[PDB]
């Protein structure tokens, strides 16, 4: 039984996130980067700022195109995975690509491309979510104009109770999994950038889920800020001194 | 690149400001729906659906096979779609695109998450043989919202599927026992306004939608936001209920 | 001076809004990471990272990519394309064919004349500092590292210009031109690359002088 | 035995076609279209009028290029078919495409492309044949210039006897299958556009086969005319009134 | 050679008007044919044939395998072609073209429809093990009519193949049972004129051909019209007989 | 970037002419090396290797499977690489280069017989252990080959056979008997730069790799790029390489 | 399966340690190619074709300062004991890559901007060294095609059987020896100028490697006179025609 | 004169390196198969095979491929691209446009005026022999076979022109123009092709005489 006396297997309460660790600017050859741990998830995102899209036919004359690639290392799962995309990888890449299309100021770079690469070194429930949070930090880290930051977490449902950031056992036996992504401006949830759901929920449980989700998103949002600022305090001072 | 999109896009947006849809229908009303089952006699199951001038056919084929090494107690359902180049001038001739794959996944999620087909009831040999259900979606005319037309068609096809037992000397034929009725409602989101059941011309504004799938008891069973846009939480609250109400009306046609 | 992140509410009056910000619903927001720069006339965000986005008046060193009868297509080392019109290069006398003054592969230092709405950049050479690079050397470093080689009030380039007696023109795009005694021009290269990799800018100005010192030894 | 008492399994004579039903213009977003039933064959054709070929290197500078694609839905056969092209689909596409290359005045549209798509929703013997007849109607319905109509039918050889429009049993157990396609102008067979043969025939059997095929072609030809004329009565009248 | 083809295309056409062929042959005569068996010792069967200056090699490999669930009482023959870049500059260095596929299929129809190999004599174990025969065609020099050259190499190779029973502990090696001689005759059609066994230069006029394959008793076992042109029923009537005849003379070469 | 790499290329060449490397390294010295094992707990084996700013992770996954018909008494080792587009905008989403990178790694391990495959048999002609070695580039700053080879053998050494998981008994370490180490050098004219950096590489992709085992024997060699190798230079670089491998081999004690 | 590859100073095929296998070389054998060569090396039967500097078409691979070199090694399905599925495999792609590089070091591509030199080599029958055999063939074809080259490329492999280094190893020595090392040198006026190709797999000592190179260099020169003779013989007539006209 | 192969030593003095050779290590080597011609000005290698590589002064026969104002783009059948500027076509007049002078399909006979560093060939028609072809017939032979068709000291084409009363112009790229009385052009045409395929050429000129007669008789 997943929930016992108000507690989940891992031991946390219905409204608690798993341990998170975030680190910005970890790759030297990428324009922007971020290492992120969300539970047993270990992901790394890299970004290659506005560059020349050479396959000329895919070149938009009025704005930049956004490309996002989600990929699992053959050694990130319990059972070795054959390298290469699958229908799932392709769908995750697409919905993630759209989440940033809605936030990036693409009009600023006609004929160019902004490629976002995300690799999950070790997977658990929510890698999709782990990846979005890392991409957001990586995009900021590269200095590409955005309307704000994107934060993502998922809500699940076990033993008929909504839970925040579901673990594997919960996603495999629960009654629903619902990953969300929000655009956050100045510490406030503005709108949603990604919404997906599989399961069985009542109209009333969906609304509650949005609320539970919003609460977790803001928490992750403060960790994204801390990671970035921490990493940028020094250059900021340098620039302030020089300027 | 352009043909008539911007002109039509300007027109669609133009009338939107007056809160009217170019065909004059309401923001919560679907186009006329026709469900015609049993059209491909050589298939275990089959159905053609007309959603306005949009058309799609779904075929259900079944053959025994081996189950996945993690669910030996379960039969298998594989959903795939072909958005053939014959459906529209934009459809590229070749392997499945991102769109073909996504339309199939949604159709596949509503059937599976609402558990319309009891997969445990399709086992032949614990970890050796189980029935394999192939649901193949084939677009014929793309005039908007192939997703919904496909979902309705898929479930209508299952409900008319006949298990080919005798053909494999595994028993006597019987109707695929369908226990639920998933239905999806797709809306076009333009700013802080939504259009239920968008058309090809309305789609000229951009591929920005929200799809909600319900089961027979009015529970949400699958949701999917698509396209690069921001969704206002208050529009979602409204569309959620509107969507549950539209799914309910559509679920009546199956009677 | 505080650091801001994209999505951060900067101001309540949109007419003051400038670089690195955007307006929505009467409010001003930051769109890039950087230092908040607010004065009485404006509200901006000083950038810390990213690729070179040109601004009117910037000096830049480019490589002629393509030749035309109406001018040259020049590579700025940025996502924005640039073009030098024949009307803006005073070294080309009428009777001369465009490929006689400037040709593919050649280097030049120009000025950002105009940035149209379609994002094209029109370059000009009709200025004091501008000129064709027929001799010397070119150095390339990340643009986000340009303000560091120039330093506070030009203190860095000065140390370099002075201590090595070499000519130096730092382009905003990150392309730098150096000329003088080959032995000295090489030391400049070396020092600019060190400055670029430098992880901790504590007393960098002093360490650079100590490098040019030991380096002048050999 | 296949032909017993002068009659064939399905019950028809040696010189008779299977039932046929044709419907011109059935697709709204195609430039031209046709729904055709020939035996247990349920096929549909769509044509997309002289459009711009995009992979620029395929663009022919002095005339239109023609592209034809024969395809079977996975549910059109007894055993579900893995979607995608196989070797015989490729050959059927190539041969069919050559038949129309000899009838379409592609010289009128240089740099352009006329795409013909045919999908077999339900397959039986002679599908190859059914698609050609469908495509021919869709081309007329699309309004593209042609020397005339193309009609196709096949001649099999059962129990040493030649038969028109063979059924599956005759194809699977006969001694030969020979598909044809002719150009027909004023109700007259002008020349052959498609010719293929498999089996064992005598120099005289070949010669008679052509004769049998031409007979069936004129019959199918009148069906093609009926289908089209029926459908165009209205617009015709409309246009006659305005003009 | 956008026009370089047209330069010699004009010459070929020029002489066609005067009713003559470029190298002086008759409109119904093949170039000198040369067949040479056993050229790839490691193969179970092979043959190299030179047709004019055109060259092709065919190799045959056998190994036991599982039959088709439908035909458990018969062997299996698979034909493949590689119109490799080696043969000509027009040959793209990639996977099977739309032309390699057709070439291999025609050759396969000739062998399959004439029952040149007794597949029923290749069963090792009803429904379990059966011999699988791989016929792989390989162009070496494309000087026109690789198809006919290929058909000849194909049977020549089959006629030299030795079932490798010893290697698979199934007994002593023996001749593959061949029981017929399929032969293809391709002609270039220009207007109302045909050129039997066209050369590379004659092909310059266009890719409009007609192929007819016959068996040992002169019956037609396969026909293929190719290219986008209209065929006159008269020419076809005359051509039908000319091809059966040409096929017979070529079939002589097989008596060694 | 053509020129940007040309600019830096001219810098590197300019310094080569004066007999110096742009980071002050000697022509025969490797950059700093860091080897961290067990970074992927879900893997049977794993190792992160940092060579200067170059980073690579190798994961080892193990599972029972059927052997090669021609060898029913030996386990199987399959090596693959993903030179993903992260940390090298030149990589496109396998390259002709990933193959050669994985191939070289594979050869070292196979020729030195670093893994006694005979000891991974479970049932003569049926069940055998399949060892999947998967290489994953993280940050490309030059010489991913040598870094990957170090990460590969290191991961194997930390590999723990999952016997219990597949009910074949107690878990135990993967048998490893040797220590392959490869050394790649950039070749410009009659000069060589051991352990080239992404910047030095701007001069051209003309290299020479040499792999040795614990007893200093050459176990694999690979000359790459469109250039001509001088014999005198090859005879000198041969010893230089064997010596460098020995020093690196010490990081495993 | 074999015991004692070097019995009484002789190998299984009967030869000494420093002797090549029988070789046959024929220049100008294809009509449609700009250059070609037929070459037999042991059970090896290979054919090389070269398509002179031609205009590369997809203008995204087109280099503006020189010609690009393309090489493609390919085994006919019937070239080996067990039928090989047609199509490139990891090893084919690698041989093609290493071989292309071998010629990039010798062909003067600077003389043909925007052009491409395609070298296609097919092995109709394989034995050990098919890769060395192809290069030898490729070299002749290029010469026969008129493409400018610093010199000629000659290749041969050195194996190691029972502690003994052997020239041009055979299938047995390769399948059961302790090392296989293919070489390729640029030869000028009958002089090994430098190395163009080098690969090794096995287990050798620092001293054995150096001995392999010298072994390889001797066999190489031998193969180099066979290349000349094949060429000269083929061109003697036209040469005399040109000396009479010119 | 013997045959030399690429890589063969021709001279120790690099001041003598001529066509088909190259200097390395202060020596001269042959780079193509060919006849070693030793003179006292150059140490060249007369080529025997390969594609056409023009040289200043060659009379070549090309075909119009592209049209523009600055001139015409012509295919001379070689890995070297060619262009015919307006400034070099006598028949060109300021009245009408270039489009009405030569279209994307015509055959011209021109001279190679200049071949620059990028191997870009510049054509010209300002010569007595140059003229747009709009008559006769064009035969195409392999360029390495043109010296046989011209024969020793022009021996061959002289023999053709006379015995057949025909006008002939041999382009170096291998394209030949023939003009005259239909029937005589056809025989000359035939003879040129047969000469190109000749296996043995000892006594070829007399043999072509007995052909010009047998075809002129029968």
UniProtKB/Swiss-Prot annotation, chain B:
InterPro entries, A to Z: ExoRNase_PH_dom1, ExoRNase_PH_dom2, ExoRNase_PH_dom2_sf, Exosome_comp_Rrp42_subfam, PNPase/RNase_PH_dom_sf, Ribosomal_Su5_D2-typ_SF, Rrp42_archaea
Domain of life: Archaea
Matches recorded under SUPFAM superfamilies: Ribonuclease PH domain 2-like, Ribosomal protein S5 domain 2-like
Molecular functions (GO terms): mRNA 3'-UTR AU-rich region binding
Keywords: Cytoplasm, Exosome
Quaternary organization: Component of the archaeal exosome complex. Forms a hexameric ring-like arrangement composed of 3 Rrp41-Rrp42 heterodimers. The hexameric ring associates with a trimer of Rrp4 and/or Csl4 subunits.
Function: Non-catalytic component of the exosome, which is a complex involved in RNA degradation. Contributes to the structuring of the Rrp41 active site.
Protein known as: Exosome complex component Rrp42
Lineage, broadest ranks: Archaea, Methanobacteriati, Methanobacteriota, Archaeoglobi, Archaeoglobales
Swiss-Prot record, chains C, H:
Family: Belongs to the RRP4 family.
Keywords: Cytoplasm, Exosome, RNA-binding
Gene label: rrp4
Function comment: Non-catalytic component of the exosome, which is a complex involved in RNA degradation. Increases the RNA binding and the efficiency of RNA degradation. Confers strong poly(A) specificity to the exosome.
Subcellular location per the Swiss-Prot or TrEMBL entry: Cytoplasm
Protein name as annotated: Exosome complex component Rrp4
Organism: Archaeoglobus fulgidus (strain ATCC 49558 / DSM 4304 / JCM 9628 / NBRC 100126 / VC-16)
GO cellular component, one term: cytoplasm
Xref: PANTHER family: EXOSOME COMPLEX COMPONENT RRP4, PNAS-3 RELATED
S1 motif domain location: 57-126
Molecular functions (GO terms): poly(A) binding
Primary site of residence: cytoplasm
InterPro entries: Exosome_RNA_bind1/RRP40/RRP4, KH_dom, KH_dom_type_1, KH_dom_type_1_sf, NA-bd_OB-fold, Rrp4, RRP4_N, RRP4_S1
Quaternary structure (record): Component of the archaeal exosome complex. Forms a trimer of Rrp4 and/or Csl4 subunits. The trimer associates with a hexameric ring-like arrangement composed of 3 Rrp41-Rrp42 heterodimers.
Entry's Gene Ontology BP terms: CUT catabolic process; exonucleolytic trimming to generate mature 3'-end of 5.8S rRNA from tricistronic rRNA transcript (SSU-rRNA, 5.8S rRNA, LSU-rRNA); poly(A)-dependent snoRNA 3'-end processing; RNA catabolic process; U4 snRNA 3'-end processing
Domain free text: Contains an N-terminal domain that mediates interactions with the hexameric ring, a central S1 domain and a C-terminal KH domain.
Domain KH as annotated: residue spans: 134-192
UniProtKB/Swiss-Prot annotation, chain F:
UniProt-listed Gene3D superfamilies: GHMP Kinase, N-terminal domain
Any one annotated GO CC term: cytoplasmic exosome (RNase complex)
CDD domains: RNase_PH_archRRP42
One Pfam family this sequence matches: RNase_PH
Gene Ontology molecular-function annotations: mRNA 3'-UTR AU-rich region binding
Signal sequence annotation: none
Keyword list, A-Z: Cytoplasm, Exosome
Subcellular location as annotated: Cytoplasm
InterPro entries associated with the record: ExoRNase_PH_dom1, ExoRNase_PH_dom2, ExoRNase_PH_dom2_sf, Exosome_comp_Rrp42_subfam, PNPase/RNase_PH_dom_sf, Ribosomal_Su5_D2-typ_SF, Rrp42_archaea
GO biological process, one term: rRNA catabolic process
Assembly description: Component of the archaeal exosome complex. Forms a hexameric ring-like arrangement composed of 3 Rrp41-Rrp42 heterodimers. The hexameric ring associates with a trimer of Rrp4 and/or Csl4 subunits.
Function description: Non-catalytic component of the exosome, which is a complex involved in RNA degradation. Contributes to the structuring of the Rrp41 active site.
Family under the similarity heading: Belongs to the RNase PH family. Rrp42 subfamily.
Name of the molecule in the record: Exosome complex component Rrp42
Organism: Archaeoglobus fulgidus (strain ATCC 49558 / DSM 4304 / JCM 9628 / NBRC 100126 / VC-16)
This protein's encoding gene: rrp42
UniProtKB/Swiss-Prot annotation, chain G:
Subcellular location: Cytoplasm
Superkingdom assignment: Archaea
UniProt keyword list: Cytoplasm, Exonuclease, Exosome, Hydrolase, Nuclease
Molecular-function GO term, any one: RNA binding
Record InterPro entries: ExoRNase_PH_dom1, ExoRNase_PH_dom2, ExoRNase_PH_dom2_sf, PNPase/RNase_PH_dom_sf, Ribosomal_Su5_D2-typ_SF, RNase_PH, Rrp41
Gene3D superfamilies for the chain: GHMP Kinase, N-terminal domain
Top EC category: hydrolase
NCBIfam families: ECX1 (TIGR02065)
Primary role: Catalytic component of the exosome, which is a complex involved in RNA degradation. Has 3'->5' exoribonuclease activity. Can also synthesize heteromeric RNA-tails.
Name of the featured protein: Exosome complex component Rrp41
Originating organism: Archaeoglobus fulgidus (strain ATCC 49558 / DSM 4304 / JCM 9628 / NBRC 100126 / VC-16)
Record lineage: Archaea, Methanobacteriati, Methanobacteriota, Archaeoglobi, Archaeoglobales
